[PDB]
Design a protein around this ligand. Structure first.
Ligand SMILES: CO/N=C(\C(=O)N[C@@H]1C(=O)N2C(C(=O)O)=C(CSc3nc(=O)c(=O)[nH]n3C)CS[C@H]12)c1csc(N)n1
Length: 265
């Protein structure tokens, strides 16, 4: 019945909702518009941090990266505090995941592929995981403002969730790097009202958020049953009918999350 519950959500919130849960040994795949393109928004910061972890040794995460106040062209709650000072790569990692800091992500794009090569390098990291579908094509903020229908800066719930299944559950990162990426997203400061609200408290929840123009509201998460069996959950939405400044419905995502919680009991 999952499909019906989802379209009611869509009806009640007046939004496009894509859901994908990868199949486990015990359960089937929960998919809904899973292969339609949704904007990354800030969810690209999770597999980006992983790309930075993977290309470099952990020795890299203690390299002070310098930047200016005129480098803060997006929401940047942490990079705010180091106008000139600058931060360790590990610090920007921490800022781009848990705090969704935009300047953080841009310096990590730069670190990953040069001033005009980071978005393609980030996309190539995704291809190296078998995502031939998602593309990053801009830096912050403009990656949040691509018009609806455009393929730029889009992923799909199916492809990001498979990327996420690799990063946390598969061997895309080695135990250590993999472990730092899991603490970072398990501390995320931005995902209370999203998937976390949708899952029972005795279920573990680790997530990274995305929010943008046209009502875009996203949450990609790895979730753990009290038995400790792991699930990957991507929830992506937008409300593009309402224009660029339409209001994202976070409760939408929580609502989507309670349904997948329901067949995963
Ligand atoms: C051009 O940039 N525009 C953005 C944007 O930067 N999106 C990013 C994204 O995905 N972000 C996330 C997050 O990680 O979810 C958020 C979380 S939303 C939020 N959390 C708070 O704690 C709070 O006090 N206020 N807000 C709004 C901030 S913007 C950034 C945006 C946000 S809503 C909208 N229409 N545009």
């Amino acid at each position: 019945d999952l499909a019906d519950r989802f379209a009611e959500l869509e009806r009640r919130y007046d939004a496009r909702l894509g859901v994908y849960v990868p199949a486990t040994g015990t359960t089937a795949a929960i998919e809904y518009r899973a292969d339609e393109r949704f904007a990354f928004c800030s969810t690209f910061k999770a597999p980006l941090v992983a790309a930075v972890l993977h290309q470099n040794p952990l020795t890299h995460l203690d390299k002070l990266i310098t930047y200016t106040s005129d480098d803060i062209r997006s929401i940047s709650p942490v990079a705010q505090q180091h106008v000139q000072t600058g931060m360790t790569i590990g610090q920007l990692c921490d800022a781009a995941i848990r705090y969704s800091d935009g300047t953080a992500a841009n310096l990590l794009l730069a670190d990953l592929g040069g001033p005009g090569g980071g978005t393609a390098a980030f996309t190539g990291y995704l291809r190296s995981l078998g995502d031939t579908v998602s593309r990053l094509d801009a830096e912050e903020p403009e990656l949040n403002r691509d018009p609806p229908g455009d393929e730029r800066d889009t992923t799909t719930p199916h492809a990001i969730a498979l990327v996420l299944q690799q990063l946390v559950l598969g061997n895309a990162l080695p135990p250590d790097k993999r472990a730092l990426l899991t603490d970072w997203m398990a501390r995320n400061t931005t995902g209370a009202k999203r998937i976390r609200a949708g899952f029972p408290a005795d279920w573990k929840v680790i997530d990274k958020t995305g929010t943008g123009d046209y009502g875009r509201a996203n949450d990609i998460a790895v979730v753990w049953s009290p038995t400790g069996v792991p699930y990957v959950v991507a929830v992506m939405s937008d409300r593009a009918g309402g224009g660029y400044d339409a209001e994202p419905r976070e409760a939408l995502l929580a609502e989507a999350a309670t349904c997948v919680a329901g067949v995963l009991a």
